[PDB]
Amino acid sequence: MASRILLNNGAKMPILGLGTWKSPPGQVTEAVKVAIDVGYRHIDCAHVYQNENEVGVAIQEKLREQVVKREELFIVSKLWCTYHEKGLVKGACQKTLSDLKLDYLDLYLIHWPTGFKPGKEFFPLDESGNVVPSDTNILDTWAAMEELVDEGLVKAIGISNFNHLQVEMILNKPGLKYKPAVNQIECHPYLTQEKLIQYCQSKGIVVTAYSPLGSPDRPWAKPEDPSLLEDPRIKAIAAKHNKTTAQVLIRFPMQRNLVVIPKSVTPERIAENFKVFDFELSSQDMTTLLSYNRNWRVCALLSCTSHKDYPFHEEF
Ligand SMILES: NC(=O)c1ccc[n+]([C@@H]2O[C@H](COP(=O)([O-])OP(=O)(O)OC[C@H]3O[C@@H](n4cnc5c(N)ncnc54)[C@H](OP(=O)(O)O)[C@@H]3O)[C@@H](O)[C@H]2O)c1
Ligand SMILES: O=C(O)CCCCc1ccc(-c2cccc(O)c2)s1
């Protein structure tokens, strides 16, 4: 298992990164410092997570300490839905750069295909509770992303939570200048994504798997929900390999040629989650884990189901 995957912009992306959604701002600086100290070279960020300044403090310390060179880091962030207007994209990127204390991002993603009305609120509502869309076509948002490459602010651009028809719309865009490098999507044994992954990979787009542990700290968890970390069938595979269930859940996407971004703020777990380059799941293990698919989502963007660009009505 090589540590990096080649992107269609010619750069290499570490297959294991640290997630930062829900990482408290008072804990994420130490989490990122620990992660870099124990070998992580890829951090997954977003403006909407509200903790990029604190992530950036850690990155900057480790650069200043000469623990790692900037060239060796792969920093990802994402354009939030209220910044899809073409005239807002550059400023959104620059705010993220300023908070992360970087001069460039390695990868900048359209966070969701749904654009929202711009303003202070990340989920602007009408008086009846619906999210207020923006009329900016996503292909115009893509052109604005391409401009960031051509200004040196980002090395690569990509997409997140795009279904296969939306990926295809980008690939068919009149005058397309840069193909997406990555589509970052939810993926784990309960949402295995075979069709979307094969489509993206067949077009040279690398897939990043989010919520690989099933996001046990997601805010809307309910007792009746399935639980990957507690699934006896997955625990049994881990026991057979003398690894933890989380380690199996991280290794699984790696063997599908995916990038994977488990989140933790717990130092011992940050280190545990990186110790996944010393064992292999068998093809039978892989087929068995794939067989657990449920089409079950952590992130269904439930406030936006009427948005014209809502991604999860289509089969894939
Ligand atoms: N593009 C998108 O729309 C999108 C959406 C969702 C997520 N993401 C990205 O993907 C990342 C990962 O997804 P996620 O945060 O939803 O969930 P996740 O990585 O599946 O799970 C994180 C949870 O697992 C716990 N955990 C971590 N390592 C563990 C271990 N070894 N043993 C037991 N528990 C462990 C964490 O606890 P502690 O932190 O307390 O240790 C936290 O509660 C996000 O942080 C974000 O960067 C992107
Ligand atoms: O899209 C992504 O990458 C993950 C979600 C990011 C935006 C959010 C939606 C709902 C969130 C939330 C809901 C209730 C409580 C709480 O503390 C947070 S955060």
Swiss-Prot record:
N-acetylalanine carried by residues: A2
Keyword Nucleus applies: no
Keywords for this protein: Acetylation, Cytoplasm, Lipid metabolism, NADP, Oxidoreductase, Phosphoprotein
PROSITE patterns per the UniProt record, alphabetical: ALDOKETO_REDUCTASE_1 (PS00798), ALDOKETO_REDUCTASE_2 (PS00062), ALDOKETO_REDUCTASE_3 (PS00063)
EC annotation from Swiss-Prot or TrEMBL: 1.1.1.21, 1.1.1.300, 1.1.1.372, 1.1.1.54
Modified residues annotated as N6-acetyllysine in this record: K95, K222, K263
Localization (cell): Cytoplasm
Recorded GO MF terms: aldose reductase (NADPH) activity; all-trans-retinol dehydrogenase (NADP+) activity; allyl-alcohol dehydrogenase activity; electron transfer activity; glyceraldehyde oxidoreductase activity; glycerol dehydrogenase (NADP+) activity; L-glucuronate reductase activity; prostaglandin H2 endoperoxidase reductase activity
Tissue expression summary: Highly expressed in embryonic epithelial cells (EUE) in response to osmotic stress.
Regulation: Cys-299 may regulate the kinetic and inhibition properties of the enzyme, but does not participate in catalysis. Tolrestat inhibits retinal reduction.
Claim: Lipid metabolism is one of the keywords in the record: yes
Gene Ontology biological process: C21-steroid hormone biosynthetic process; carbohydrate metabolic process; cellular hyperosmotic salinity response; daunorubicin metabolic process; doxorubicin metabolic process; epithelial cell maturation; fructose biosynthetic process; metanephric collecting duct development
Annotated effect of mutating K78M: Reduced glyceraldehyde oxidoreductase activity
Disulfide bond residue pairs: none
Annotated site, Lowers pKa of active site Tyr, chain positions: K78
GO CC aspect terms: cytosol; extracellular exosome; extracellular space; mitochondrion; nucleoplasm
Major localization class: cytoplasm
Its job: Catalyzes the NADPH-dependent reduction of a wide variety of carbonyl-containing compounds to their corresponding alcohols. Displays enzymatic activity towards endogenous metabolites such as aromatic and aliphatic aldehydes, ketones, monosacharides, bile acids and xenobiotics substrates. Key enzyme in the polyol pathway, catalyzes reduction of glucose to sorbitol during hyperglycemia. Reduces steroids and their derivatives and prostaglandins. Displays low enzymatic activity toward all-trans-retinal, 9-cis-retinal, and 13-cis-retinal.
Description of how the protein assembles with itself and partners: Monomer.
Protein name: Aldo-keto reductase family 1 member B1
Organism: Homo sapiens (Human)
Gene: AKR1B1
